[PDB]
Amino acid sequence: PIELLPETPSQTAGPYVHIGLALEAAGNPTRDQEIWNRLAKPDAPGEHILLLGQVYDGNGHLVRDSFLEVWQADANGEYQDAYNLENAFNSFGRTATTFDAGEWTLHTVKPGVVNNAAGVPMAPHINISLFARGINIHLHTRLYFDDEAQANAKCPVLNLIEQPQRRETLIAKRCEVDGKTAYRFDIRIQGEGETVFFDF
Amino acid sequence: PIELLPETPSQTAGPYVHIGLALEAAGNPTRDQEIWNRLAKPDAPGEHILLLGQVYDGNGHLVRDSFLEVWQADANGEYQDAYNLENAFNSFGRTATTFDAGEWTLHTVKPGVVNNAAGVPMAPHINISLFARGINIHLHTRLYFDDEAQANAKCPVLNLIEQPQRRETLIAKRCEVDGKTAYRFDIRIQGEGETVFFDF
Amino acid sequence: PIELLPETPSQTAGPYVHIGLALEAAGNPTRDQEIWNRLAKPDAPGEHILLLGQVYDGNGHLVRDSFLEVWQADANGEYQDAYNLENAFNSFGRTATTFDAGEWTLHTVKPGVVNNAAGVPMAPHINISLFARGINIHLHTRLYFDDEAQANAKCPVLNLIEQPQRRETLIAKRCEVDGKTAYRFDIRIQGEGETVFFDF
Amino acid sequence: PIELLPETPSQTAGPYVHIGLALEAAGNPTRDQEIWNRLAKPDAPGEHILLLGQVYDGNGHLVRDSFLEVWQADANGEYQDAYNLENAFNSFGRTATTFDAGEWTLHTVKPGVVNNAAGVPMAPHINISLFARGINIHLHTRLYFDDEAQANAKCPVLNLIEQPQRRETLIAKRCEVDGKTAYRFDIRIQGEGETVFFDF
Amino acid sequence: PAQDNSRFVIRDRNWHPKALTPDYKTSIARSPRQALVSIPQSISETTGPNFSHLGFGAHDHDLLLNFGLPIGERIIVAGRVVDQYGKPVPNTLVEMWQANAGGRYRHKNDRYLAPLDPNFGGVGRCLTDSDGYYSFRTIKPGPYPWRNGPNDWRPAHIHFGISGPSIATKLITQLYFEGDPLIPMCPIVKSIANPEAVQQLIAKLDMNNANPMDCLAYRFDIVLRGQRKTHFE
Amino acid sequence: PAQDNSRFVIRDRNWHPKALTPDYKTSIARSPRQALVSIPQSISETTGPNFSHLGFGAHDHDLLLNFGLPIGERIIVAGRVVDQYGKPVPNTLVEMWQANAGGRYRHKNDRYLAPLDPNFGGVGRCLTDSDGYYSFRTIKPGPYPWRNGPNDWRPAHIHFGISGPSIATKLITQLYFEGDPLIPMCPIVKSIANPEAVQQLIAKLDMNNANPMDCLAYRFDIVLRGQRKTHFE
Amino acid sequence: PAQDNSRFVIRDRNWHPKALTPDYKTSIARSPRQALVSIPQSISETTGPNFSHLGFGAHDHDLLLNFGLPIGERIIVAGRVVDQYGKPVPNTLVEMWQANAGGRYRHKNDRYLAPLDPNFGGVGRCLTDSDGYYSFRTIKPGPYPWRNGPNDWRPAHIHFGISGPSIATKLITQLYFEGDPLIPMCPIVKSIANPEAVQQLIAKLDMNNANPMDCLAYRFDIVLRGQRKTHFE
Ligand SMILES: O=C(O)Cc1cccc(O)c1
Ligand SMILES: O=C(O)Cc1cccc(O)c1
Ligand SMILES: O=C(O)Cc1cccc(O)c1
Ligand SMILES: O=C(O)Cc1cccc(O)c1
Ligand SMILES: [Fe+3]
Ligand SMILES: [Fe+3]
Ligand SMILES: [Fe+3]
């Protein structure tokens, strides 16, 4: 058969990932421009929301050194790839868990709908990548919204999960933080209620 | 040492086992004679019973594509190897789980007592072999009856199971179905209350 | 792929083939029972005929050291395999070419019709095998009769020969010797009008 | 020495070449545009001629499954490489032999004169490539015209052919078909009067 | 009735694939976490069904006729069933199933885009002869994609089920075809640790058994657990 | 019109199959007995048709659509056309033909007993791109018997015809499939004396170009005669 | 906005380190037990951020200046980012972090007794050029002990983060130094089963790229998943 060059192997980000990718978190001075957790400026079209979560290990303990990367369409279901701090909305963001509480936060807008390769609409979702010491290769997941039951029930992706109980692991719970629309998306890496992780 | 020819390696039956071994269930036309789940004709000597169960995976989810094979003595505790659709009773049968409900059924008679190699009587039991996609090599188990407590207590086989709590996994629960004597035998492949499987 | 034991390799019969298979011809005393050129006793059913011919090499020169073996059905289109000097008819015979004249003769009857494996009748024919010095592996051929044009035209075997001109090389020209029904069949090993040779 | 990548090895076109390169002849429906045997439209400049021929094997038997490709200059001795069905004249064409008659035909014009690399004029000619089952690598030849004897005698290509008698094999014989100027060009792959084949 | 007169050579569990083979995704949740309990052989385990009297149809073993002619490479699949001692296993039940020429299965749950073949079912059964031989006539199945990794393809294969003399010998396996480049990449094939074990599942091209101008043939011999007489028990 | 501005590397006639290869019976009477006459390259030989302006149909290269869906192994056959110097051959004509899944050709003269496929023709054509790339979508053909020796079988193959920049480079060949056990037994394949040459004819399984859950892919690169500029002529 | 016009070569999960690699303690509790669910590529996965417009500082890539001079081995770390097909990845984001010369990181959580270097921060970023080249200037990090087994030491390494053209290609890895005797002893390095994969993580001493009487240099090339255009989808 045909073999291409092999991809460079992954390695864990380790516990100090923050010094390279979350300066403030590492407790070091930041540079002029940093990629952080504010995807949208107040003046951005769409329904402004707050996302928050906690990460758990197989023992039910908080993973306080986690690093997350998000990818999402804008309110119009469009991916804005030209990253710029001047933008009112950026499709890409970064966040991490507090060494204290162990909770991450993100300020964005609820994504619009996008079609899969076969033209079928996928429910509004956020693409997440998780990194941490103990994780050799980062973990892929999706965050869906509980108030999108209808769309959710029809998602070509959610429907690839054999066991329905498993799909529930990808649904964020609508809440309010300081009377502001929020969604809670906890990730369980291992064990009871373990979150579905994808390969693509 | 001496080494014989090695045995042909097993492979999973796969998801489509039904086409080859459970035509009716594959939803395909059957042949004149098929090996199915009716071991005894109504005119067969012994206590006519109905067997039923579900198969669960390590997640506690129904295994809807399982294939099962049974071997048991007649009411006199005799093994009838000459398979014939004409026979009032056949010692061998096949069943499978509903793609829907996920339950298999068997129509037979309660087996008589059989002695082990050393001449000690074993409690009435039914030998089972489980096959399914995900199963590399089939699982062997035994179904015992809850109304044979006295016999069960003295089974040399059941007694080989180190932990008493595990022996219980092998005991079918007597009930009635349409005023008929039935026993329910659920199989847990992995985890909580995992069924004992044998090597012989 | 599967490989069987290899067949013993052929070697030419050499110039002295006669001493072993044509004693009279080698000019040595014969034994009580010899396999020769008279397939039928006068009292054999069927049209008694005389077969004769010559063998030519690539230079058009007579091959005077040839050895031939023949196999044919009886007048009923039947193969008589139990060779016996007592039989009125034997399906097998042997002949050779004079070191002088270079001609062979056979005394038989016109073979009955036989069907190929597909149940299609083949034209009356005599199977021949030719051996001689210079021939590493014997040549196979068939003798057909000019007076069976109808049958010849329909033969599934003769019909397998691509070029019609080549088919003619297999037809014996009927004649008469001492007012006896005879057929002349000359073989041209190589060159102009080279006789068709088969592989089976 | 220096070695480059080896050219892909040729293989016989096989008996079904027609399906791929002579749709009509395979007796299959054709596509919108096909490369066929009409190089010149009625309104193409030059003298309109008909070319026809038969192909013979070493046995003097017609080769009924042959496939031919032709390359020639227009009447002005120019090579027209931009192939287009709209063109009045195409320099490139295709033809094949009837499964029956085993005769090919081409509709074109008599090519003008071209100079060889040394600036010397070549006699009017048609470049031919022959393909068929039994031919591992295609045969190259040239078609010259008998009515161009003067030019022919001076052809730098024709002159490379050592024996004059071999040169004759390359000359098409002028005739008339339905009072149309036609030239017959028979190809003899092997034996007596074997046509000259080139290497370049 | 059946008699407890035999003993069967203990199975080599390092030879056969293990229960937990992570690359074969479905095995994760369908493999026991507790060790298997070994039990001594009894009449229960050393006997099994005899199918000599099953009423087999005339084309039970001919996939070309038992369902027009299917489309695909016409092949004969034949072999012998023997035990570890090299003793033939006469009058035993051999059942097989497979997809069509395009890798499509005639089963409700098969949604692969390769079309069904109107003249192809894909099921066969054969009772071995006095010498342990069986044969089937079918078409060569096509490989097929499956939801395991993002780009997994099973090599072309035929599913097999062999009864043998007892429930102790009964086995289900899969036959692969000689030279198939998909073999070494399959997570199911790789469920087997010893490459030598893998070789046992490969059917060899058998020109010798072929019907010229008609169909090719593949050779597949099966070895069941050795059967021995009880001694000093 | 075309112009004489190129020279093509001379062909290695010991690399290519010879004319007379007696195991391939039909070559006996269709092979010249006199030597080929070598001649220098002229405009006659260094030029050829350019097919850039031929009107190709939208599915000219998709055998799944150009004739229901055909039955068989869905595959993509792709590769690149380059010269001996490793230079790409852009806008060149690639034509192909083959049998169906069963080894049956859609041709009057094919009497093989395997059925024809109602949705399959077996012909494709494709013009290479700017980088010398071509692709075809089809189904994997089956081997088939032929009247050579009493039990000869052609390995699965696709016939190819490549134009190249001149008549000097025009070539016809056959692609074989990686691992096919038939390959080494083929008298036609054996018309080639160098094993290294045979390897050039084998398409390789290309998982990287396959469409997951849809079809597999094979890679087949073609090398035409090297093209150089004339010098000190 | 971004468009779905590409497909990425499926990752080889047997090439990359597995999730559960017990010698690396933390992996025990931080690895999923359920199999990953494979999904088809969509715009969601085949697109990602372009960093062309991020406002980089003049010494973003120069660790010697971006935080006096740091104490330690002055080196240049440079190389190229390519895809599996060998195509360069222009204007892509390369981020790195490391410890000082004594193995001390400038992070709250680092309590190792080797002191911090007053002129060293340990962070750099560089956007690749048109040819996929990046370069950094820094000091060679020292190895460092960690609570794993009782006497575990990380070989000297630089952490790397590469974006690539999509989230599908994004990668985090670590660079090791040619000849480091600690390499073969590391449980983390050992998370990788193929020794050939390990070699890919080792930067090579590059004397040709060194600055005489100034600093040494190391070459580290990165290969991202192959990008191809969709076909017959
Ligand atoms: O967990 C640790 O302390 C060791 C470690 C492991 C991997 C990368 C690092 O930077 C550090
Ligand atoms: O689980 C699957 O879909 C793949 C599969 C695996 C084994 C045998 C099969 O027929 C099919
Ligand atoms: O032609 C010969 O004289 C030599 C020869 C060849 C083969 C067998 C023999 O007995 C003799
Ligand atoms: O001559 C034949 O029938 C066999 C054959 C040989 C080469 C290519 C083919 O398509 C077929
Ligand atoms: Fe062919
Ligand atoms: Fe299968
Ligand atoms: Fe580190």
How far away, in angstroms, is G128 Cα from ligand 1 center?
27
Chain D CB contacts of C163 under 8 Å are 59, 61
Which pair of structure tokens corresponds to residue C12?
């030419």
Residues A174, A176, A181: CA angle, nearest 5 degrees: 75
Judge whether A185 and A172 are in contact, CB under 8 Å.
yes
- Provide the 10 A C-beta neighbour count for residue C158: 22
Phi, psi of F208 (to 5 degrees): -65, -25
Chains B and E touch (3+ CB pairs under 8 A): yes
Nearest by CB to G54, from A33, A132, A157: name it.
A33
Q: Is A16 in the pocket of ligand 1 (CB under 6 A)?
A: yes
Beta bridge partners of E138: E75
Of E16, E80, E106, E159, the catalytic one is E159
Q: How many Cα atoms sit within 13 Å of G94 on the Cβ side?
A: 29
Judge whether E116 and E124 are in contact, CB under 8 Å.
no
Give burial (CB, 10 Å; 0-12/13-18/19+) of F150. exposed
* CA separation for the pair B181, B48 (Å, rounded): 7
| Cα torsion D40, D42, D46, D50: sign | positive
* CA separation for the pair C172, F144 (Å, rounded): 36
Beta bridge partners of C105: C52
**C neighbours by CB contacts (3+ pairs under 8 Å):** D, E, F
Q: F176 a known binding residue?
A: no
Residue F70: what residue type? P
Q: F61 a known binding residue?
A: no
What is the number of domains present in chain F?
1
* CA separation for the pair B47, B58 (Å, rounded): 35
**Rama region for E10: left / alpha / beta (φ>0; ψ in -120 to 50; rest):** beta
* CA separation for the pair A169, A186 (Å, rounded): 9
Q: Is B15 in the pocket of ligand 2 (CB under 6 A)?
A: yes
DSSP string, D43-75: T-SS-EEEEEEEEE-TTS-B-TT-EEEEE---T
Q: How far is CA F169 from the centre of its chain?
A: 13
- Provide the 10 A C-beta neighbour count for residue D143: 21
C-beta atoms of A19 and G122 within 8 A: yes
Q: Is B48 in the pocket of ligand 2 (CB under 6 A)?
A: no
* CA separation for the pair D126, D116 (Å, rounded): 14
- Provide the 10 A C-beta neighbour count for residue G48: 25
Domains of chain B, earliest start first: 1-200 (2.60.130.10)
CA dist A60 → A56, A194, C193, G24 (Å): 6, 11, 94, 19
Which pair of structure tokens corresponds to residue F40?
């220098």
Chains G and D touch (3+ CB pairs under 8 A): no
Name the pairing type of β-strands B125-131 and B103-109: unpaired
Chains A and D touch (3+ CB pairs under 8 A): no
DSSP string, E75-135: EEEEEEEEETTS-B-TT-EEEEE---TTS--SSTT---SSPP-TT---EEEEE--TTSEEE
* CA separation for the pair D7, D10 (Å, rounded): 9
DSSP class of residue F203 equals E
Using alpha carbons, select from G213, G178, G227, G214 the residue that is nearest to residue G198.
Answer: G178
* CA separation for the pair C68, C49 (Å, rounded): 18
* CA separation for the pair C171, C2 (Å, rounded): 41
Which pair of structure tokens corresponds to residue E41?
């052989």
Judge whether B107 and B92 are in contact, CB under 8 Å.
no
Q: Is A135 in the pocket of ligand 1 (CB under 6 A)?
A: no
Judge whether B181 and B50 are in contact, CB under 8 Å.
yes
* CA separation for the pair D63, F8 (Å, rounded): 31
Q: How far is CA G193 from the centre of its chain?
A: 19
SS3 at position E161? strand
C-beta atoms of A10 and G16 within 8 A: yes
Judge whether F11 and F164 are in contact, CB under 8 Å.
no
Beta bridge partners of C127: C71, C142
C-beta atoms of E147 and A200 within 8 A: no
Chain D CB contacts of C165 under 8 Å are 61
Nearest by CB to C199, from F150, F181, F185: name it.
F150
Judge whether A172 and A145 are in contact, CB under 8 Å.
yes
* CA separation for the pair A25, F88 (Å, rounded): 53
Q: List all residues 6 or more positions away from C27 whose beta carbon is below 8 Å from its beta carbon.
A: none
Of F154, F176, F218, F225, the catalytic one is F154
User: DSSP 3-state helix, strand, coil percentages of chain D (rounded to 5)?
Assistant: 15, 30, 55
How far away, in angstroms, is G49 Cα from ligand 7 center?
26
DSSP class of residue E31 equals S
Output the domain CATH number for residue F89.
2.60.130.10
Phi, psi of G165 (to 5 degrees): -75, -15
Which pair of structure tokens corresponds to residue B92?
């061998």
DSSP class of residue G2 equals -
Which pair of structure tokens corresponds to residue D81?
């490489």
> Any idea which residue has 């309010």 for tokens?
A176
Continuous segment of H or E residues that includes residue E175: strand E171-177
Q: Is A19 in the pocket of ligand 1 (CB under 6 A)?
A: no
Q: List all residues 6 or more positions away from B38 whose beta carbon is below 8 Å from its beta carbon.
A: B93, B107, B108
> Any idea which residue has 């993580």 for tokens?
G201
Alpha helices in A22-92 (DSSP H): 23-26
C-beta atoms of C2 and E204 within 8 A: yes
Query: What experiment produced this structure?
Result: X-ray
* CA separation for the pair E43, B78 (Å, rounded): 10
* CA separation for the pair B82, B43 (Å, rounded): 18
CA of D61, closest CA in chain C: separation in Å? Answer: 8
Q: List all residues 6 or more positions away from C179 whose beta carbon is below 8 Å from its beta carbon.
A: none
**G neighbours by CB contacts (3+ pairs under 8 Å):** A, E, F
E159 as an active site residue: the answer is: yes
SS3 at position D111? coil
Judge whether B5 and E227 are in contact, CB under 8 Å.
no
* CA separation for the pair A137, A163 (Å, rounded): 25
Greatest Cα pair distance, chain E, in angstroms, is 60
The three-state DSSP-derived secondary structure of F103-148 is CCCCCCCCCCCCCCCCCCCCEEEEECCCCCEEEEEEECCCCEEECC
Alpha helices in chain F (DSSP H): 43-46, 195-199
Q: Domain range holding E84? A: 1-233
DSSP string, chain B: ----PPPPPP----TTHHHHH-HHHHT-PPPSS---SB-B-TT-SS-EEEEEEEEE-TTS-B-TT-EEEEE---TTS----B--TTSSB-SEEEEE--SSS-EEEEEEEPPPPEE-TTSPEEPSEEEEEEE-TT-SSPEEEEEEEGGGHHHHHT-TTGGGSS-HHHHGGGEEEEEESSSSEEEE--EE-SSTTPPP-EE-
* Radius of gyration from C-alpha coordinates of chain D: 17
Give burial (CB, 10 Å; 0-12/13-18/19+) of A96. buried
CA of E85, closest CA in chain B: separation in Å? Answer: 6
SS3 at position D80? coil
- Provide the 10 A C-beta neighbour count for residue D62: 18
Chain G CB contacts of F214 under 8 Å are 232
F225 as an active site residue: the answer is: no
* CA separation for the pair A20, A43 (Å, rounded): 30
Which pair of structure tokens corresponds to residue F14?
């010991």
F105 as an active site residue: the answer is: yes
Q: Is B16 in the pocket of ligand 2 (CB under 6 A)?
A: yes
* CA separation for the pair F54, A61 (Å, rounded): 69
Give burial (CB, 10 Å; 0-12/13-18/19+) of F216. buried
Q: Is C98 in the pocket of ligand 3 (CB under 6 A)?
A: no
Of E24, E61, E105, E225, the catalytic one is E105
**E neighbours by CB contacts (3+ pairs under 8 Å):** A, B, C, F, G
* CA separation for the pair A67, A104 (Å, rounded): 9
- What's the residue count for chain E? 233
* Radius of gyration from C-alpha coordinates of chain E: 19
E231 as an active site residue: the answer is: no
How far away, in angstroms, is C63 Cα from ligand 3 center?
15
Which of G154, G160, G189, G201, when mutated, tests ligand 1's pocket best, judged by the most ligand atoms within 8 Å of its CB?
G154
